[PDB]
């Protein structure tokens, strides 16, 4: 998983276009943001561990307004309705942050309340020191694909000098890692079978 | 910077280093190098070796986990070709082993009966099916084999019940597993 | 508490510090457990003929 | 300062390092970074690796222990399906095994008797 794959054969995209001209979402940052969620990985295992495309949780899940109490103990289990609402969400907070500021609705990624509410505070004062790390790298992650005003502070912030950029730690990290020595190749059984 | 570098995740330890090269930024207001960028510097390397180290264990982990999934893999097949009418064994002990399962386990087939039995019941069918479904894999099942052990409770306690009958001379209220043992047998 | 601002002034680097409690100086380090509460599930054989 | 480092609790050290650093300012009265302040840095940045050293074992015997918890949970889990009508095996070659409960030992199944029997001894 490298840059993100933006030109790559686009598997399984049938959804995004249709969610995007619904709600009003760019067609990129939807599937940036489904892609960082889960990778399009069918399994998309964790302490959690939500296969759909959207990683949610359960409180979100039941927060969004769905019928998630219903099928396989969730139902944002079937990719269309999962991604629409997402979509919506999506789309809901864009719209109300004045315009189409499209890294302050990244609250997706913190919410509002006792721990989203100070740092959308902090970002609308520009101060990126308050803001969490999982946030600051969330957006980070999302500077290539979104609209802002704030995308040219954000990534000048970090620099080794003051007019360095800083670095994300997906490019920081890009290349470090270690290949799975196991895999999916079974060994086969051969029946004794004998015809006389 | 050293509480930045004694993180477990160095994906939050980048970003804590960013937080301080900004910091950083505001005492230091111009290009030259310094003692203490040179601190930042040698933080990010430390911090790129840590992901190395790290990325060892998540690989390792998942080969762990990924080696238990060929194992149930390889003896879902196993117990397919056996129902299908081909002469395989079904016992743990007899199947085939390759770098990418290691060794069989009595828990390995344990959680494999759960599961298959689990599968069965979250099928949409009548419930006739899945009583073939499920008598299907206790014939396919070996001599000591986690199906045959599952319904081997049914079969001492029915076999207790009639000899207990016999000692005293009459039969309790409840049989239950007289009945369901009879009800399979039909 | 009168010492309230003696005690927080105590154990500075320089006269003109403040002590680090260690609640502070050790925070954030530490590891998570690997073993949840998530047990594994057993299932009946069930079949009601 | 050295034997501030080798003790075995780091918050003890962190506190006896506040201590030292308390009496230095009384022998070096200003701002200035001295060779001896140098000292009490490094020391604490060794009582914060000491630290992460530290959490490693702790966490470490805490998933032992709770690997046991959870092995005694499944047992019980097992003989209340059991009792309640259903078809499965209590033995503790027949537990079901993941990666929070390990191998299933006798001495298992011995302590649940023993903390069972207790419980129902316990009962009003």
């Known amino acids: 998983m490298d840059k993100y794959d933006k030109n790559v054969p686009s598997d399984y995209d049938g959804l995004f276009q249709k969610a995007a001209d619904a709600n009003g979402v760019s067609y990129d940052l939807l599937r940036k943001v489904a892609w960082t969620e889960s990778r399009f990985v069918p399994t998309a295992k964790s302490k959690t561990g939500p296969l759909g495309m959207m990683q949610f949780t359960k409180a979100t899940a039941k927060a969004l307004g769905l019928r998630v109490t219903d099928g396989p103990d969730d139902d944002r289990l079937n990719p269309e309705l999962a991604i629409n609402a997402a979509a919506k969400q999506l789309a809901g907070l864009v719209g109300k942050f004045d315009g189409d500021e499209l890294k302050a609705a990244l609250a997706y990624n913190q919410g509002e309340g006792r721990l989203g509410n100070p740092q959308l505070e902090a970002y609308s004062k520009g101060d990126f020191a308050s803001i969490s790390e999982e946030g600051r790298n969330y957006m980070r992650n999302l500077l290539d694909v979104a609209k802002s005003p704030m995308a040219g502070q954000l990534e000048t912030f970090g620099g080794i000098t003051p007019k360095g950029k800083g670095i994300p730690a997906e490019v920081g990290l890009a290349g470090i890692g270690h290949k799975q020595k196991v895999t999916q190749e079974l060994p086969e059984s051969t029946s004794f079978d004998v015809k006389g | ?186």
């Open chain 2, 1 to 186: 910077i050293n509480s930045a570098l004694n993180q477990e995740d160095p994906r939050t330890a980048w970003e804590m280093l960013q937080g301080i090269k900004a910091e950083l930024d505001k005492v230091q207001p111009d290009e030259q190098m310094t003692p203490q960028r040179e601190w930042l510097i040698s933080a990010q390397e430390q911090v790129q070796n840590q992901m190395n180290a790290w990325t060892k264990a998540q690989a390792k982990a998942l080969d762990d986990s990924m080696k238990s999934m060929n194992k149930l893999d390889v003896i879902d097949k196993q117990f397919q070709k056996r129902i299908n009418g081909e002469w395989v064994s079904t016992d743990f002990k007899d199947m085939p082993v390759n770098e990418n399962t290691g060794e069989f386990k009595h828990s390995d087939m344990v959680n494999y009966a759960n599961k298959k039995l689990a599968e069965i019941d979250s099928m949409d069918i009548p419930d006739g099916a899945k009583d073939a479904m499920k008598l299907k894999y206790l014939q396919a099942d070996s001599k000591d084999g986690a199906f045959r052990t599952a319904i081997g409770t049914m079969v001492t306690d029915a076999g207790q019940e009639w000899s207990a009958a016999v000692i005293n001379g009459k039969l309790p209220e409840r049989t239950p597993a007289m009945d369901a043992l009879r009800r399979i047998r039909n």
